Amino acid sequence: SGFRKMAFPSGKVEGCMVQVTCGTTTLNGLWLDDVVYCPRHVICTSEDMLNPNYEDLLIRKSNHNFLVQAGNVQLRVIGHSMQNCVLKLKVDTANPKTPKYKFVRIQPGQTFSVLACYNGSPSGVYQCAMRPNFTIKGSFLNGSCGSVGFNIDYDCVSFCYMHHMELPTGVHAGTDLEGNFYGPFVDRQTAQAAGTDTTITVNVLAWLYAAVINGDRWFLNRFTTTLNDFNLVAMKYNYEPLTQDHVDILGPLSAQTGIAVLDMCASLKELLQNGMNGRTILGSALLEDEFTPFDVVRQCSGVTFQ
Amino acid sequence: SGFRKMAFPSGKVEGCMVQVTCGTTTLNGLWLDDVVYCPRHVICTSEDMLNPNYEDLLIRKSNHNFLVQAGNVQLRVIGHSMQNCVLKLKVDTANPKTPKYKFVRIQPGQTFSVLACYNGSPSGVYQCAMRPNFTIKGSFLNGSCGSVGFNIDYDCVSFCYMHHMELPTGVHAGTDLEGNFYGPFVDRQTAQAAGTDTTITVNVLAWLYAAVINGDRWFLNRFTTTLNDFNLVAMKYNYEPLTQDHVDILGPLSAQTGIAVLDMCASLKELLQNGMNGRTILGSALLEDEFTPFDVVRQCSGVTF
């Protein structure tokens, strides 16, 4: 029992983190086999930040302008190329700690672990979710760029996020590992703002199912709803629309608890109307939306506490 | 900027986790140098768990009754002994991945990272605090026993917790790595109740400082208080007493923010007496008490390991 924001163990990713320096700029890179991936803005200077021409900046660099340090060892850069917003530095050594891995581009609402790093060294690990407005609510300081987000279902690391920037509201933006940004953002310091964010409805429903699995039913009610009526109400509270795909994904939790998905939707409607009246759910006084259905199944018992 | 419940990187500990099996019971062990540490109740069966005599159970076991597996490799057990509630299995090979480490016993209110493991394989990491009632609010299923809690400083892993059991309210109890329980618990298959818990005041103040560092300031006010008056309020809301040592420990955050501890105490007093009036702090509608002052400093300054 219990329910925590649980990250994946970070060791398989720690062994891939390196420091990349170009000029006076230092950030983190990800060393997989004989390639180091890092944000391309490592090649910018101070006069470059608003409208950098990355193709023009990069042609002026040789391999030896990039200093890559793995722990105490310098790696030798033997080639470089840019793919979208990431730089790929070919190095002369394959990383002996490379885990089994893949690159995946995730959808809003998906969660992942972040290993926050500075100067190629890990500082901590935490869970994040891709918000509907394609930002993440991270914890990142100067020098954290190139830190990555990942999942490790089974034995394989799926890298899904590379950190590039902080927006004015204090939230964060970055790319997949092919260098395409999530959302409409660009790696320029021109004025950019995140869109209005919404709550991830399917994740709130998953977390209510987690609460039932762990033994709490106080928030259920005798009512049901149609999917259409639920979405009409949910939108009034800035909740994302719930689709038939989301209803299907909740199937296993519904089966384990005996609570039909649209009955849990009626419970959520009432919670939005009433608040918690001084109670908590899984230790929270707010409705939590950064656990996915898959996260709940990963963490919770397969036996409900009836 | 931003502020998240952050665990330590777990790689140094992952390399130490093994699977220990005795009879039909399987749980996790911690392999350091040439010793594997695990809960002594691995030697119990069903008819033993209600009132175990561990000294008598251990005599019937030979070294080959303990099956220790590190990944795909079996370790050969060459000795066994018990220290309080921890079994120590001497093995024939030192763990080549042993980090610099020590065993430490923590105080209530201190936080640590848990590496939750099953069948010797790490499955997740999260941050926990030792509650004033010596439980932790963990997330553990059958087979999680022997999972460990730890802190890191520089290069040294300080192991502080080994998981043994779940209490009826769904919170968790365990030992230090010398086998001494935290709290008034025993390793027997009986319902044992956690005492009434209280809120860790110095940690709530640390988190209010984190909120200020991150720009969330609505709860600051013109008032200040004394330690004595604040502690009357703390007692009334089931908060731990705030000592002068706590005031000193908040010194670095009070310096980084420029806000005196007793000024912040006047803010917390008002939050306890009036609530949040529908607002949140760092995204929470509750007063969070599982960040220590050092946790706030470590996260807000980017400290690496």
Where along chain A do its domains lie? 1-14+100-197, 15-99, 198-301
Q: Could you tell me what percentage of chain B is helix, strand and coil, using 3-state DSSP and rounding each to the nearest 5?
A: 25, 30, 45
Tell me which of B147, B280, B304 to substitute to probe the interface with A (most A C-beta atoms closer than 10 Å): B304
Q: List the 41-80 stretch of B: residues with Cβ below 8 A of A.
A: none
Do A290 and A5 contact (CB within 8 A), yes or no? Answer: yes
Resolution (A): 1.7
Who contacts B179 (Cβ-Cβ below 8 Å, separation ≥6)?
B40, B82, B83, B84, B85, B86, B162
Distance of CA B269 to the CA centre of its chain: 28
Class of domain B15-99: mainly beta
Would the CB atoms of B6 and A122 count as touching at under 8 Å?
Answer: no
Buried b (16+ CB within 10 A) or exposed e, B205-232: bbbbbbbbbbebeebbeeeebebeebbe
Of A7, A11, A166, the CB nearest to B14: A11
Name all contacts of B247-254 with Cβ < 8 Å and 24+ positions apart.
B249/B202, B249/B293, B250/B202, B250/B205, B250/B206, B250/B209, B250/B293, B252/B293, B252/B297, B253/B206, B253/B209, B253/B210, B253/B213, B253/B293, B253/B296, B253/B297, B254/B209
Q: Which of B9, B280, B286 sits opposite A115 (nearest CB)?
A: B9
Return the exposure string of B156-190: e unless at least 16 CB atoms fall within 10 Å of the residue's CB, then b: ebbbbbbbbbbbeebbbbbbbbebebbbebebeee
Interface test with A, best of B3, B6, B299 (most A CBs within 10 A): B6
Look at A8 and B126 and tell me if their CB atoms are within 8 Å: no
Regarding beta strands B100-103 and B156-166, do their DSSP bridges make them parallel or antiparallel, or are they unpaired? parallel
User: How many Cβ pairs within 8 Å bridge chains A and B?
Assistant: 137
Fold match between domain A1-14+100-197 and domain A15-99: yes
Q: Is B123 on the interface with A (CB under 8 A)?
A: yes
Closest by CA to B230, choosing from B264, B265, B201, B275, is: B265
Q: What is the CATH number of domain A1-14+100-197?
A: 2.40.10.10
Alpha carbon distance A134, B141 (integer Å):
34
Please answer whether residues A213 and A299 qualify as being in contact, where contact means their C-beta atoms are separated by less than 8 angstroms. no
Question: Which helix or strand (DSSP H or E) is residue A266 part of?
Answer: helix A261-274
Examine the residue annotation and report whether B41 is marked as an active-site residue of this protein. yes
Best CA proximity match to A290, nearest among A201, A227, A211, A163:
A201
Q: How was this structure determined?
A: X-ray
Instruction: Mention the CATH class of domain A198-301.
Output: mainly alpha
Whether B164 is catalytic is no
- Distances in Å between the Cα of B7 and the Cα atoms of B114, B125, B203 are 8, 7, 16
* Identified catalytic residue from A38, A41, A117, A164: A41
